[PDB]
Design a protein around this ligand. Structure first.
Ligand code: ZG5
Ligand code: ZG5
Ligand code: ZG5
Lengths: 591, 591, 591
């Protein structure tokens, strides 16, 4: 349910278990021989946190099918078993199974959101053998979704999505402590009064448990209130803004336990064809990104996180989307301090069995939401919407939720699949932030169950690449026509993906596809049409940087639609966008 | 003096402070306004650990001169002030100044070796403001050495060495605990009896403090001895080998404190023209490397550390040198588990004022060891040899010490400068491992104070690049002649650097410098001559991968002598070496 | 003396001998064995026209020293010996020696200008063995100048200039015919009357020999005059313009011989700080180029010539300079039709013994114009100014003459060396077009013998590369100061070279030298200062495209200062200039 970001507290420790662990690829005989009971024989080395896929050589290791075993000796002091000892796994991709001294203690499905387990009971005295087994198999029951081919009898994951299936202990595995009665969750909303020309705010609060002090940026304490629930009143409040963050601090002392949380006071609501942040008409400038670096894979990369942010501010972007899964907690906290607008997105990519040849049962092609042969994820999909919104509910950076990336949202079953999730999203988000789903090419205003369920229309369109390339003038005609029609909903339309594979170094004065000149022309065509429609409130390119995918004829050593290379070096287009975004403000570009 | 690697212990905590800290570049008014007393106003963000140089945009930030301020709120629990609270800085580059709540508590010179401070006294109750200031200025008093030009009035570091002056909190800043009477140091040597065809060993031990148990790889406990000093006897001992490591474990319980250490039992001594590991004739296959990745700078990179090791084993290398500074503790422990031969090297690069135009006092060119105007580092140089050997004395991977890289070792003052350091190196190394210094081009057997002080001759030669390029046949003649002469010392000769700048992607059937074909021909010429001399016991290419340097006409976006690119992608030469090293064994290549 | 471009004529044939000839590298015994008498034994193949250097593999072939032998069987019909049979060598680099059936018939020094020989006498009946020997040795007697090192006993050319010493039959070797009394030369000037708002012109003419008809573009015949000398009067004349050429045709029928010549009527004179084409204030937009393509070397490349022109018009350039030698006749005729302003430049590069360490006779460093040990080229230098101006005197494209590229023009002897050449240049150019010399970095207004001899000041400056790089702000200060001072001559100043080596593909958001971002910043800095001075009338970047040079540490597989790669693919800077030159007109940018 509730996962608070572990951070050093007068009440709580925090011991990062990150390092080189023992590691062994599982064969068929891994569990049969209960490798978790005894130290791993003939073991290899593996850093944690990290995707393991690129950290050893050979295709058989990169493309491994199934389980791997991590193992590390753990040891707490007796003088601290007094407090309760929690194990927090920031993320294990995809499915984890945690053993201690040989006994199962936790299982988790879902490889991109945190989970924890309590250790006091089975935590012995001395060096205990911690073993985490990680499974990477994807299918019709996982988010993301594994298919049966590219989007031999040798078992083989086949992603129904266009990124590499990086797995392992993606994010840090820490340990922290907690008074036996402790702060378990905290929720903070903000009603802002833009009536006073010098606006002020009142901050609802509540603390779940099983004394509240407010400070400003510099540590200036300002007010205090007692108890579980209550309120705060701030006048001349410093509003969190895009590219101009301000974080108040919040100290919740309750019993022998105290936790601090940064918070930004910020308004967001949609109003006709206008996305309004602090009651001003916003325009998204940014991109769809990945957690993808070398050689960490999906592994958390704090230096790259900061370098990416620096490149955004250098480029005059203001937002990105957590395509196609929730990002690290550290990244979220970082865009809080840095003032980056996030579109927080779930792991629900590949809910769409039209990709490739799909799957044919009884010779008949199976539809996405066929209830016997199609996707079997809505239960898991709901837990994801639950854990995600619980984890990130307080981040001022989060301005909206993306429930799915390119689902078969114009097919039979789609509305009935997505309605309970949209409902759960608006039910659980204390700030009632707008929800959306990113619509695959092919859908229309009429046919897209997004046209009703979603507060904002988010399109992934590829006119001038997949559709119309290399003829950019013909493709522009296509883009205007489809874009016009979307205006008939009187909702905000924004593009969450559009791009063109571009191999850094390829050029021609008379451009062809894959060259840097073509990439720039492609975006000039699209951006020209975007500017013609005052209900278009955002442009986010795909992708921020080149990233790794499964191999196919259509993937030139990964996805090459980045504006920057995988090591964040600009392509010519990166300087095109920097110059365009320099003349487009965060607020009032449309009005 | 003694720095043991902090790791979770039944007796000791370990709380990694790594994360995004507050950060501010210092102007002239930083200390005058005592920024350490109050939280940093108008502050920026910066991950730790990491070099800060590449993590924000703009030359003024990359090329910053002077101080920067890191700042993080810290907080321990009262239920633990019982134990002593230590702050361990794995490395701060170059000069650190640690404040707590506004009061100085530690200073350190030397940016590549660990130091600690005790916190109990000034560690208050609640959230304490931790501030670390970092200085990057280099000169004639620092190791490495800063010069006065490339190797305006605007203050400017000018490295007297060919890598970029990456600074910041390079390595992790952790906190661990310790019973008020604790294990402060541990030393373990090994006398091995190769008389028994099934060799066995006795392991001297000693514990400095202010119960010893032995286990094997799997945790099998084998023996026990009590007290500070003592011994162990192992028969049919499993010897740590190159590319075939075996680590025993060692559990030292003393009082309420217990620490475990991995140890590999291994022999090393030189014998005429033979470098002998476990009394067998070794041959170094590997490279000189850097701690250099993007965007971490010199910052510790555990995933790359493991990926590098995988590439070595893939390439059939067996060794590298910590050019030109001690590497992270984690890396050292890793080559212990992985069986990689290390040449542990100090920060003593640029002890050589002949680089560039040098410096001219009174119009006369200043010699390196001029006692009034030359280098002023021998005092610091000794502390480095002290801290380094103390830190890494137990690593089986360490096979030798490099006291300096390319000092002016054929100049007046050189012997008198290096003798006390060589002496201190052999005095302090409990295993009496061979010592050397890496000799710059130009020195001869006759003129090099290395010919007497050093157990092994380590050459950085560039015949076919700087010297003779592009004429490889003329250059080969030069290399044979100089290499012949070195054979007259009857000592082991090995090359620690040789290479050719190569821009990945450049090619010609008829090669020119900077192409991949030239790089391969260059190494074919050199390697041919190396094979002609049975006293040559090692080949280590410069460099393992492309890395960043200061800008100059001669540096094509860094140093391009890597066999791999900065993101570890092979150049054609990498496959040349893989194929050559496949047919060269670790032992008996020479005999 | 006079070389008219051979073209099919009712009076004259033209048989192109271009093809695969026999070819043999000369060893020491080539002439001793009179290989020219008998067909080449053990011969190789070689296309003509072409530089031979890159057309076979191996450094010994590329870096060959001395002579090579071309050989082709020739054969004319008897029914045509009636007319006189001429052999025209468009260019042989450097020194040629033409044999026929074994007998010497011609010698030529100078590898970039046409020469001919008459064949009737020694032209037998049947298949005659034509043999051309080509020498590539350069030294203090050749233009360009060969030095004694980079700018073993094994003989070796060492260019005193920064391009590769490509040699062979660079340009076509044709045969044409001629009535025994024939048109040998033609000269046409134009006095233009800009008094009439609808300007008109009178065209002086003269024909040297040993009927004149005028047509317009479409073949419209307009007027006629008889005899050797005479005149033409044209009203409402269509003026040849930059980027808007108009070529009249001219049919000179004299006896049994008739030749046609295209001509553009165009005015050029300098007036204070103004370069005036057709009495309007011109501004050069373009570059310094090379005749350099793969694999032709310096060999003529008509398709690239046209592709280059297309790229100029695409980029909005209007001019280039024939750095550093006269280009092909075909190229000149092409910029006539295309309206490209040419700066016609001689082979006089490397008249400057300060490059490198120079040469030291008697231990004393030899000055450039030292009359016993220095350059010995002024005699040859005059013949070059003679042949060049004779060849290209009628090309409307030629707007100016460059007598030398970067001579030691601020040294003792310089004025006395250049005065007789400047004089000869103005004496021989019927149109009295302005003359200049391109000034190496280091010279000033005061010290440059160009400040007096030259009508226009042409600078090769590298502030922000060689001088000041990577500090572009410091370098800009330097450039303004030197540029200011040049304004004190009240003459037109233009830059004929400025640039920065840039390896296509290298990038950083925070730029370093050799990246594409640095190249663009470099030109932004320079171009900013150029715009501050209304006496600056031209910007020509070095270079149009990457080109081949001798190997050295400072040459990353050739010269990388091109805006385009060697295969004419744009670097990012090419699009920077295209966008800047789009807003700068050909006329009136300054006024
Ligand atoms: O274009 C992109 O790279 C991004 O856009 C979207 N895909 C969704 C699917 N479709 C096409 N893609 C793929 C993807 C993987 C392998 C092969 C293809 S063949 C193809 C052929 C014609 C038209 C379309 C496709 C559109 C692109 C995803 O949301 C995002 O994951 C992906 O990265
Ligand atoms: O060649 C390498 O890249 C490595 O080898 C060694 N240097 C030592 C010095 N010298 C030359 N170098 C440099 C280095 C930096 C800037 C400029 C130069 S100009 C030069 C010109 C002619 C001969 C030699 C040089 C040899 C190389 C160092 O030990 C190691 O730090 C360095 O990385
Ligand atoms: O920069 C360019 O590439 C062009 O500009 C001009 N040279 C003239 C000489 N000098 C430098 N050059 C060279 C050239 C060849 C080899 C090595 C060098 S080291 C150097 C070091 C510091 C300052 C200058 C130089 C200026 C550049 C020529 O006119 C043109 O031939 C050449 O191509």
């Amino acid at each position: 349910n509730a996962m608070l970001y572990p951070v050093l507290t007068q009440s709580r420790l925090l011991s990062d278990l990150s390092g080189v662990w023992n590691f062994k690829l599982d064969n068929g005989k891994g569990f049969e021989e209960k490798w978790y009971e005894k130290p791993l024989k003939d073991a290899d080395t593996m850093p944690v946190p990290a995707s393991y896929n690129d950290l050893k050589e050979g295709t058989d290791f990169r493309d491994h099918y199934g389980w791997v075993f991590y193992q590390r000796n753990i040891s707490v002091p007796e003088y601290v078993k007094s407090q309760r000892i929690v194990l927090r796994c920031a993320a294990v991709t995809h499915y984890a199974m945690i053993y201690l001294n040989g006994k199962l203690i936790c299982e988790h499905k879902g490889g991109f959101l945190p989970f924890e387990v309590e250790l006091n009971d089975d935590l012995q005295d001395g060096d205990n053998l911690l073993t985490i087994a990680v499974n990477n198999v994807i299918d019709y029951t996982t988010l993301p979704v594994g298919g049966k081919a590219n989007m031999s009898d040798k078992p083989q994951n086949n992603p129904n999505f266009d990124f590499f299936n990086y797995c392992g202990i993606t994010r840090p595995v820490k340990i922290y402590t907690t008074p036996e009665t402790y702060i378990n969750d905290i929720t903070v909303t903000a009603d802002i009064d833009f009536t006073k020309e010098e606006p002020s705010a009142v901050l609802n609060y509540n603390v779940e448990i099983k004394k509240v002090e407010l400070f400003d940026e510099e540590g200036t304490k300002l007010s205090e209130t007692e108890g579980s629930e209550g309120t705060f009143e701030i006048s001349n409040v410093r509003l969190w803004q895009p590219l101009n963050a301000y974080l108040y601090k919040i100290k919740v002392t309750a019993g022998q336990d105290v936790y601090t949380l940064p918070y930004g006071v910020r308004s967001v609501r949609v109003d006709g064809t206008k996305f309004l942040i602090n009651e001003k008409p916003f325009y998204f400038k940014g991109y769809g990104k990945h957690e993808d670096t070398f050689p960490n894979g999906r592994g958390i990369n704090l230096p790259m996180n900061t370098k990416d942010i620096s490149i955004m501010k250098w480029q005059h972007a203001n937002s990105f989307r957590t395509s196609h899964y929730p990002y690290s907690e550290e990244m979220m906290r970082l865009c809080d301090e840095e003032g980056i607008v996030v579109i927080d997105e779930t792991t629900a990519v590949g809910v769409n069995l039209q990709f490739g040849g799909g799957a044919n049962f009884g010779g008949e092609r199976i539809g996405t939401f066929d209830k016997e042969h199609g996707v079997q994820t809505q239960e898991h999909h709901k837990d994801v919407i639950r854990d995600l919104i619980s984890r990130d509910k307080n981040h001022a950076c989060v301005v909206m939720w993306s429930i799915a990336n390119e689902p078969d949202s114009a097919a039979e079953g789609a509305y009935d699949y997505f309605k309970p999730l949209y409902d759960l999203a608006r039910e659980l988000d204390p700030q009632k932030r707008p929800c959306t789903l990113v619509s695959v090419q092919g859908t229309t205003a009429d046919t897209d169950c997004s046209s009703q369920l979603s507060d904002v229309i988010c399109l992934n369109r590829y006119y001038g690449w997949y559709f119309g390339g290399p003829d950019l003038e013909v493709s522009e005609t296509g883009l205007r026509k489809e874009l016009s029609d979307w205006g008939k909903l009187g909702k905000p339309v924004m593009f969450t993906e559009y791009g063109a594979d571009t191999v850094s170094g390829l050029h021609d004065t008379t451009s062809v596809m894959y060259t840097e000149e073509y990439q720039v022309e492609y975006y000039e065509m699209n951006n020209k049409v975007f500017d013609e429609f005052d209900f278009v409130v955002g442009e986010q390119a795909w992708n921020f940087a080149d990233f790794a995918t499964s191999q196919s004829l259509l993937r030139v050593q990964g996805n090459k639609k980045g504006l920057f290379t995988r090591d964040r070096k600009p392509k010519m287009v990166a300087h095109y966008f920097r110059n365009r975004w320099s003349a487009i403000p965060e607020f009032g570009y449309k009005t």
